[PDB]
Amino acid sequence: TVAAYNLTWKSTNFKTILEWEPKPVNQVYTVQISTKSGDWKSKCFYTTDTECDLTDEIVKDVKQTYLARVFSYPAGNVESTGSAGEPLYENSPEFTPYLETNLGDERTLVRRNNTFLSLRDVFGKDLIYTLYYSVQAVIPSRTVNRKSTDS
Amino acid sequence: IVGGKVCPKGECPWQVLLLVNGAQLCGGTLINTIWVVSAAHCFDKIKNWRNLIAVLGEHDLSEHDGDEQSRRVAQVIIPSTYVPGTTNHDIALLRLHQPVVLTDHVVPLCLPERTFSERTLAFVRFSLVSGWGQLLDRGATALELMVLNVPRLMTQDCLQQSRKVGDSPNITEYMFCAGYSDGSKDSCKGDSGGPHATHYRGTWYLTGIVSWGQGCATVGHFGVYTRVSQYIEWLQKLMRSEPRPGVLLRAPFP
Amino acid sequence: GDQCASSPCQNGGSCKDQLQSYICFCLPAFEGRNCETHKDDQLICVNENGGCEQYCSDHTGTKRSCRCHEGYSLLADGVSCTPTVEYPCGKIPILE
Ligand SMILES: N=C(N)c1ccc2[nH]c(-c3n[nH]c(-c4ccccc4)c3O)nc2c1
Numbered sequence: 176t177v178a179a180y181n182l183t184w185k186s187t188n189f190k191t192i193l194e195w196e197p198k199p200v201n202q203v204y205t206v207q208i209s210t211k212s213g214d215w216k217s218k219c220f221y222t223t224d225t226e227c228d229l230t231d232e233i234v235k236d237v238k239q240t241y242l243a244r245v246f247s248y249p250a251g252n253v254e255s256t257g258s259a260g261e262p263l264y265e266n267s268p269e270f271t272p273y274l275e276t277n278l279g280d281e282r283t284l285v286r287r288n289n290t291f292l293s294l295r296d297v298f299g300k301d302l303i304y305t306l307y308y309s310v311q312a313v314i315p316s317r318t319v320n321r322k323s324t325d326s
Numbered sequence: 327i328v329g330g331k332v333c334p335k336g337e338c339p340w341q342v343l344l345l346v347n348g349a350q351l352c353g354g355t356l357i358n359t360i361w362v363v364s365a366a367h368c369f370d371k372i373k374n375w376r377n378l379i380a381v382l383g384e385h386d387l388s389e390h391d392g393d394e395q396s397r398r399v400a401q402v403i404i405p406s407t408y409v410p411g412t413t414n415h416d417i418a419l420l421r422l423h424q425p426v427v428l429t430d431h432v433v434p435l436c437l438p439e440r441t442f443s444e445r446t447l448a449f450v451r452f453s454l455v456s457g458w459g460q461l462l463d464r465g466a467t468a469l470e471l472m473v474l475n476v477p478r479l480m481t482q483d484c485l486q487q488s489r490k491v492g493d494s495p496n497i498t499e500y501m502f503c504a505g506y507s508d509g510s511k512d513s514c515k516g517d518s519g520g521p522h523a524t525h526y527r528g529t530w531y532l533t534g535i536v537s538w539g540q541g542c543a544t545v546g547h548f549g550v551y552t553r554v555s556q557y558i559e560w561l562q563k564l565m566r567s568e569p570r571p572g573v574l575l576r577a578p579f580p
Numbered sequence: 581g582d583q584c585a586s587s588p589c590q591n592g593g594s595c596k597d598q599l600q601s602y603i604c605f606c607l608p609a610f611e612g613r614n615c616e617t618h619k620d621d622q623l624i625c626v627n628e629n630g631g632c633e634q635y636c637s638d639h640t641g642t643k644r645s646c647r648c649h650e651g652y653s654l655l656a657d658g659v660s661c662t663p664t665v666e667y668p669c670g671k672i673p674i675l676e
Pocket residue numbers: 351352367368369370371512513514515516517518536537538539540541542543548549550
């Protein structure tokens with residue numbers, strides 16, 4: 176079994192998909208996601224994909240910091256374990272949706288009561304848009320990402 | 327228990343205290359009225375075998391209130407694979423001479439099914455660990471039962487996060503790590519044999535036995551616990567067997 | 581599909597174009613980049629214990645079954661357990 180590597184969060188408007196490598200040769204993967212104090216939840220069970228949508232989990236609380244890990248199993252032997260009697264895995268980067276998700280009123284993927292909440296509902300009377308003085312959304316308190324693409 | 331809290335009386339009903347000649351030996355966990363799970367290494371130096379006692383319903387070691395129940399330990403069964411003085415396969419199954427009576431203060435901890443423990447309980451983040459051991463390394467043992475909520479780790483992460491040089495054995499598949507590496511919270515001397523108990527959907531299960539660590543709350547280190555899922559089969563088989571004679575029995579493992 | 585004009589969002593989802601990329605907004609019962617995974621199809625024991633309160637057993641070509649510990653019996657809904665005894669293991673009487 177080879178461990179996954181290059182675990183990466185691709186996220187735009189809270190639609191969050193973890194991606195990783197390699198393309199599996201006779202191997203399958205499962206992902207677990209948690210917040211730092213929460214329990215691990217499994218997703219994309221025994222997939223041959225190298226991506227896993229995690230939107231559903233991260234929009235529950237977009238202000239948490241999630242960590243994800245990817246397990247590698249022999250396809251067929253989904254009960255594989257290394258010397259520690261545990262399946263091989265690799266961790267992702269930490270991801271705090273609210274501070275790292277790329278920006279694209281516009282509904283985001285964050286749902287409240289199944290309806291989607293829009294950008295302004297998630298960022299409050301605290302989100303601002305550049306005109307020149309072409310619009311660009313900016314979240315000026317961000318360390319990363321901060322400005323959207325232009326319109 | 328370093329950095330824990332006093333377990334309110336009765337909120338840890340499965341906690342056992344083992345005494346040899348009246349002197350505290352180790353903790354233990356009640357899995358039903360006549361069977362107690364503790365750690366094998368607690369028995370490395372036992373000579374007065376008749377003088378081994380288990381107390382249930384205990385809380386405050388200084389004041390006897392009505393709730394304590396003491397039973398002589400009729401037999402101590404340890405894996406044929408445990409080597410005295412080492413830390414691997416550190417589990418002991420104790421047969422009490424007569425059953426305890428379950429009460430609001432004496433209740434067994436559920437020994438979970440292996441697959442449930444492995445695919446579900448092993449991924450509940452926090453579990454409680456407990457005992458009357460030292461409240462700081464080389465510090466005073468406690469008088470009232472202490473309980474500590476510790477987060478568990480997969481061994482890759484434990485080995486990635488731990489510093490090498492110190493008395494640290496291999497973390498085998500028969501062990502897991504839980505705790506904190508910032509020097510604040512851990513189990514300690516006097517807590518061996520005691521429970522690591524996981525809550526899942528309203529019930530509590532036995533996932534580990536307090537076993538060993540580098541000091542107690544040493545920075546760059548975690549507490550190490552016997553991974554009980556590896557022994558469920560062995561436990562249940564033993565508890566169904568006809569009593570062999572002998573106080574100490576080394577039962578075949580697997 | 582490929583980018584939005586080529587209808588990438590399966591199972592009734594709505595596509596939304598980005599810089600050549602898109603975002604699929606799924607319906608409540610689906611997830612995945614293309615709304616392809618049906619939430620309803622993963623009732624397996626590795627998945628949130630199969631919804632069972634205590635023990636879970638997957639079965640070949642048939643629905644998993646939930647089970648309980650000694651001292652407990654499975655309830656009508658096929659997932660919950662109830663104590664059949666006075667002092668069921670793993671319960672703390674002064675907090676019950
Ligand atoms: N850092 C920890 N997580 C830790 C936990 C339990 C310990 N138990 C002990 C321990 N040190 N010596 C003995 C002992 C107990 C009874 C008989 C013989 C040795 C112990 O149980 N050190 C311990 C350290």
